[PDB]
Amino acid sequence: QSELDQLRQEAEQLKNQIRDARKACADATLSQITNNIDPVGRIQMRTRRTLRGHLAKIYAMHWGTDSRLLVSASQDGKLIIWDSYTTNKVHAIPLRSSWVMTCAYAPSGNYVACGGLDNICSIYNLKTREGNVRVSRELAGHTGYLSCCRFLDDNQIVTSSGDTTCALWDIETGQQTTTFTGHTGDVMSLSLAPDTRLFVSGACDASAKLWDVREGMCRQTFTGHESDINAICFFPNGNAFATGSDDATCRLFDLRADQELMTYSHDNIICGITSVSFSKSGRLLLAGYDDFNCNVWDALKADRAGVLAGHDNRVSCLGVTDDGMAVATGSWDSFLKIWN
Amino acid sequence: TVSLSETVQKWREYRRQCQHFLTEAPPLATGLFCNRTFDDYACWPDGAPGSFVNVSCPWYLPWASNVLQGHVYRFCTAEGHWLPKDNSSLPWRDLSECEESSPEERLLSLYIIYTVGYALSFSALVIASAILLGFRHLHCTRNYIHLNLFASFILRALSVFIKDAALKWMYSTAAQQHQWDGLLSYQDSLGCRLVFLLMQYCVAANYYWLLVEGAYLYTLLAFAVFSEQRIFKLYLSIGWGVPLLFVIPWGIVKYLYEDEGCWTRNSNMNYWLIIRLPILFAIGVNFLIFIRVICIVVSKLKANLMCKTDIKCRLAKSTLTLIPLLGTHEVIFAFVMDEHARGTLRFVKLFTELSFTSFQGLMVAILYCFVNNEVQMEFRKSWERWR
Amino acid sequence: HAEGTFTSDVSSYLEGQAAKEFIAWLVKGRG
Amino acid sequence: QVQLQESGGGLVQPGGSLRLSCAASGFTFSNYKMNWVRQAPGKGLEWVSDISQSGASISYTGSVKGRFTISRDNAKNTLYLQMNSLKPEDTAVYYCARCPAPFTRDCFDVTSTTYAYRGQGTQVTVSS
Amino acid sequence: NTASIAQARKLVEQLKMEANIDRIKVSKAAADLMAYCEAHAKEDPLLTPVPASENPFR
Amino acid sequence: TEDQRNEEKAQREANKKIEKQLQKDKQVYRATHRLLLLGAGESGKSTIVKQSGIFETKFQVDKVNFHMFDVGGQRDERRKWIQCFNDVTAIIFVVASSSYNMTNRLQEALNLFKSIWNNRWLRTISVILFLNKQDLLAEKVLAGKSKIEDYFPEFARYTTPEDATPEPGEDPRVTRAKYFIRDEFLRISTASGDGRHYCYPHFTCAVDTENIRRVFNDCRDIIQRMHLRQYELL
């Protein structure tokens, strides 16, 4: 006996050693160097589209890789595939489970997945030859609700779940290629990388992790956060990433710098960050907040460049076209607002 | 009571009769007789010089039966001239035998001026609707409906304003000239007929919209609303639909069967009640629905809401706020039947009550929609939002 | 109707007073 | 990181008094509703006592009501449990946990097994 | 104490593998952020006023 | 022009079919009443319904469609996912009434109830209360080895409701105790002070009698109070 105690001393103390390695790296700060940067000035978006199609509150969105289409999931069990330009409905899919907490669009547009409290990953094919959109493949390996997912390809796809673990699946076999574990809570948010080498994930342990898609190992654990991590998005180039949290602060972390880059907070905001997303360059950081006002920050200068009026109820989801051509805002008002 | 139409018609007839007398009565043996004459009001026959000339009071006067034995006189002087008034060309005459209260005028005359304040209601109602449409997040069955009620107070407003122009044209023309007002009233017998029939349509409109809202609450509470868009179009169709489909037979049938000009219904004695029964029926619906709404509100308040130890009477006052919306006050005017024919004492509460129902629109719109906690919260939140 | 009836009386007085104005206008003055 | 350092605990004969401390860091202790939650020997989690940011709103489990003192030092960002009326039935594993969400009323702690914000905890034992 | 030993071991292995990794001088990283911005800065619809011809919504 | 005109036609029909489907969807959907049933375990949450996934229940009652849901398939970290239901007609909170022993996990039920009650997202949701294990509560209380009075001393001086309903052969403390816990949720009811939602007690395990009459009538009344509250009566 008395082994767990020394385990605690050696374990946490070592943790202190890692902390030492982290803080020694602090030779500069992004804020120090942003003095020289010309800021953005007051620049705001405007409502280019008002999308009235949903009966219930819109809980999540995703862009189609064409920067044209975008996918929306509704709490009513309807999964609607929308068209930005013609503002019509590209497809309408009845869900098996009325509760959908997320959905995503395939890189090729072949498939679209959704998920929620149903504990199952619903894969729908857009290529159905016999007819309209039908259930293509269901992936149920999860011991917890289906929180989120994003496509690596048409075959293998990452999912996150309240089972506290993340999973890399393959549709055809119906099994998981590999399963990633080691967070202490539900994995609430994820963002894949453009190069799909590795992926970040936010969870309820107030820590953002970088895993490796292929290796199956935890590469890095970053803890700067004050509270739970609601939403997280990797930087376009793959070298950095942004974090939304319940801390009521959006925070910027680097993978390669292995420590906190920057903190965005405000003295007047008691409400958490629902969702986050980038700009083309990564100079602008979009943040949706529970106050129903979306602050547009300058991911470098750190001052809010602008704000988004909009939905009268909570902002659920936020997304930017792969080419950064457009911004999309889902809320619980059943209305989608598209901005630029 | 005597309308203009028979007044002009009968007068022209009297004038005609005089036409045959003056043209056709025998020529005089000598001109020393005063010549027969039409004063355009009476027919004077030939007159002997130096004698009194008499003609009966014109029989078409509204009070002719009260002055059936009156006569007016001219004086024929002995020179074969009608006796002349000094400084005037009319004959020395006695029309005193043909000469002929109503505190109601203060209620009657001032109400239109008083109704000028009623015009204020329209303005606020319009802006209230503008607020309702204004930011687009309020569209729902509850607000589309209340807005169309607002439209029905609008249509009554416009009907009363047009209605007041309609009567005033008759008055001011009477000041300037009424020779055409009789004919202009014949075009009104198609025109003002349109205006008044619209008037029926507006009052029926506003009350029948009260029907629709009562159905909204009772239907809402009792069981689920079914096919809200499709069923709703039928709801709108009863709200406007019942006034034309019902009223137009009554209005056109009443008009053509008994064309009493721009209208007095009491003489008809058979149209008011027959139209009133559906309108009264509507208000009776208001009585049952209002009684059930408050009985339900209190019933719910007592069970567990009371377990919050909250004095009811203040909340009951809050419930009283509902009263302009369903207008379930007219029943005091719905006691009136066919024989009753209103009442002199009733006339005061009946009329003042009418003013209240007219203000039902302004007060209702401001009371629960222009000043709504959610609407104020959204209006203000949008105020900062646009800022 | 509810407002009408009360005005129907008003128009009855209008017809009365107007007829009277016709009487004064015709009997004395120009008619 | 996010950490809470439990002090105190040990064997105490019933009836004593103790000022328990919890060190907060990795977050602003001022903004979080705090509570002490115990997991009894061979027993599931049970909420024990919570305290508002201001230290005004304060609730206890029926037994510990008024007889136990939860006190927060915000300026020092440390939490305290002062024990009176100690019983051997109160002996348990005491964790000091913070409510997850900032600036709120509810809390979703006392969640069995995994829970984000919690220290290593102490053993508080009341001898017989 | 019997149930904790698995988490103790595996988590210590977590510290073992995640303790030694390649860290870059921060100034270089942040300079990379600003530079990447210097590349896409004109490709940024929100940053660069979009010509209505090239605006998808106008 | 051929592509744009041609897509206006084809996609136009797409829009017509989809939208008409939508109007067919909103009425059927919104007409139903979705309820969130949750309890720790042994809640007889499957028993009430026993007399789509296993969790979701589709039922017809008195010309009123119901959608019950079981969260029994999820872990105990709820703060993330429980926000999914703020339009749900009601949160049914089902607790075993005899759970005061072991530890008094009913005290946990109290805390969790305060939790649901306190969320900004649930401010508009009424909680229907299921006290399960009524008889087991009464008997368990008479057992005495583990005492409520440690965890609820105020029972000694907290007073019986006026509507007292003892069962045949029932020591008055048992009945008053029952309503006493109910009142214990009541002070929680006044904790908000908003008046938007309310706690309606229920009894199960007394007999197998259906809660549907309760469930319905109370739900009916609740949403009626959404209309009334939004109609400025309350």
Select from A15, A219, A282 the Cβ nearest to the Cβ of E33. A282
Say whether the B–A interface has 3 or more Cβ pairs within 8 Å: yes
Amino acid at D85: S
Declared resolution, Å: 4.1
Residue corresponding to tokens 């008046």: F195
Instruction: Specify the fold of E1-58.
Output: G Protein Gi Gamma 2 (4.10.260)
Q: What are the start-end ranges of the H helices in A173-266?
A: none
The total number of structural domains in chain A stands at 1
In angstroms, the CA B383 to CA B264 distance is 52
Q: How far is C13 from chain B (nearest CA, A)?
A: 9
Phi, psi of F96 (to 5 degrees): -70, 125
Supply the range of the domain harboring residue A289. 2-339
Give CA angle at A72 (A70, A78), nearest 5°. Answer: 140
Interface of E with A (CB under 8 A): 1, 4-5, 8, 11-12, 14-15, 17-19, 21-27, 29-34, 36-41, 43-47, 50, 55-58
Q: How was this structure determined?
A: cryo-EM
Tokens read off for B244 = 């034309």
Contact across the interface for C4 and B200, Cβ inside 8 Å: yes
* Run of H or E including B114: helix B104-134
Count of residues making up chain B: 387
Tokens read off for B387 = 């800022």
Q: Could you tell me which chains touch chain D, where touching means 3 or more CB pairs under 8 A? A: A, F
DSSP per residue over F52-121, as a string? Answer: --TT-EEEEETTEEEEEEE-TTS-S--TTGGGG-SSSSEEEEEEETTTT----HHHHHHHHHHHHHH-ST
Q: For residues A298, A303, A307 and A313, what is the CA-based torsion angle, rounded to 10 degrees?
A: 100
User: Can you give the CATH number for the domain in which B86 is found?
Assistant: 4.10.1240.10
B97 contact partners, CB below 8 Å, separation of at least 6: B57, B67, B70, B71, B72
Phi, psi of F198 (to 5 degrees): -145, 165
Beta bridge partners, D122, equal D94
For chain F, breaks with the C atom over 2.5 A from the next N come after 51, 102
Residue corresponding to tokens 């942004």: A242
Phi, psi of A51 (to 5 degrees): -100, 110
Which residue in chain F has the smallest CA separation from D50?
F111
In angstroms, the CA B363 to CA B118 distance is 11
Supply the range of the domain harboring residue D55. 1-128
The total number of structural domains in chain D stands at 1
F24 in contact with A, Cβ within 8 Å: no
Q: How far is B224 from chain F (nearest CA, A)?
A: 6
Q: Which residues of B touch A333 (CB under 8 A)?
A: 137
Beta bridge partners, A277, equal A286
Q: How is residue B301 annotated by DSSP?
A: I
In angstroms, the CA F31 to CA E55 distance is 42
The total number of structural domains in chain B stands at 2
In angstroms, the CA B174 to CA C14 distance is 10
With DSSP H G I counted as helix, E B as strand and the rest as coil, what are the percentages for chain F, rounded to 5?
45, 15, 40
Using alpha carbons, select from B252, B243, B285 the residue that is nearest to residue B271: B252
Q: Using an 8 Å Cβ cutoff, are B257 and B271 in contact?
A: no
In angstroms, the CA B210 to CA B156 distance is 13
F33 contact partners, CB below 8 Å, separation of at least 6: F64, F65, F66, F67, F89, F90, F219, F223
The last residue of one of the domains, among B41, B76, B98, is B98
Using alpha carbons, select from A340, A329, A308 the residue that is nearest to residue A60: A329
For A327, the 3-state DSSP assignment is strand
B177 & B54 share domain: no
Phi, psi of F129 (to 5 degrees): -95, 125
Query: Is residue F231 exposed (0-12), middle (13-18) or buried (19+ Cβ within 10 Å)?
Result: buried
In angstroms, the CA F182 to CA F161 distance is 10
For A36, the 3-state DSSP assignment is coil
Q: How is residue B303 annotated by DSSP?
A: I
Q: Tell me how far the alpha carbon of residue E23 is from its chain's centroid.
A: 14
Using alpha carbons, select from F15, F53, F28, F55 the residue that is nearest to residue F39: F55
* Run of H or E including F129: strand F126-132
In angstroms, the CA B139 to CA A259 distance is 49
Q: Which residues of F touch D62 (CB under 8 A)?
A: 104, 107, 148, 150-153
For the stretch F71-108, what's the b/e string if a residue is b when 16 or more beta carbons lie within 10 angstroms of its beta carbon?
Answer: beebbbbbbbbbbbbbbbbbbbbbbbbbbbeebbbbbb
User: Strands A327-331 and A304-308, how do they pair?
Assistant: unpaired
User: Can you give the CATH number for the domain in which A153 is found?
Assistant: 2.130.10.10
Count of residues making up chain D: 128
Domain boundaries, chain F: 1-234
Residue A338 Cα distances to A84, A93, A274, B384, angstroms: 8, 22, 17, 21
Ramachandran assignment for C29, one of left (phi > 0), alpha (psi -120 to 50 degrees), beta (any other): left
* Run of H or E including A276: strand A273-278
- Tell whether domain F1-234 is in CATH 3.40.50.300: yes
Query: Is residue B112 exposed (0-12), middle (13-18) or buried (19+ Cβ within 10 Å)?
Result: middle
Q: Using an 8 Å Cβ cutoff, are D117 and D79 in contact?
A: no
Q: How is residue A33 annotated by DSSP?
A: H
Using alpha carbons, select from B332, B329, B350, B205 the residue that is nearest to residue B279: B205
Instruction: Please identify among residues 45-84 of chain A the ones whose CB lies closer than 8 Å to any CB of chain F.
Output: 53, 55-57, 59, 75-78, 80, 83
Tokens read off for A284 = 């602008």
In angstroms, the CA A19 to CA A158 distance is 30
Q: Using an 8 Å Cβ cutoff, are A200 and A254 in contact?
A: no
Q: Using an 8 Å Cβ cutoff, are A117 and F71 in contact?
A: yes
Determine how many CB atoms are found less than 10 A away from the CB of residue F199. 18
Q: Using an 8 Å Cβ cutoff, are B328 and B287 in contact?
A: yes
Determine how many CB atoms are found less than 10 A away from the CB of residue F181. 23
Give CA angle at A235 (A233, A240), nearest 5°. Answer: 105
In angstroms, the CA F180 to CA F141 distance is 13
B343 & B229 share domain: yes
Residue F129 Cα distances to A194, D24, E43, F59, F212, angstroms: 49, 37, 57, 20, 13
Domain boundaries, chain E: 1-58
Beta bridge partners, F23, equal none
In angstroms, the CA C20 to CA C17 distance is 5
Our separate counts of H helices and E strands in chain B read: 14, 4
Residue corresponding to tokens 């602090």: A26
Tokens read off for F64 = 């009123």
Query: Is residue C24 exposed (0-12), middle (13-18) or buried (19+ Cβ within 10 Å)?
Result: exposed
Give CA angle at B147 (B141, B152), nearest 5°. Answer: 125
B207 contact partners, CB below 8 Å, separation of at least 6: B279, B282, B283, B327, B330, C2
Using alpha carbons, select from F183, F221, F187 the residue that is nearest to residue F201: F183
Supply the range of the domain harboring residue B353. 104-386
Count of residues making up chain A: 340
Residue D55 Cα distances to A107, D33, D80, angstroms: 52, 9, 12
In angstroms, the CA A286 to CA A61 distance is 15
B110 & B86 share domain: no
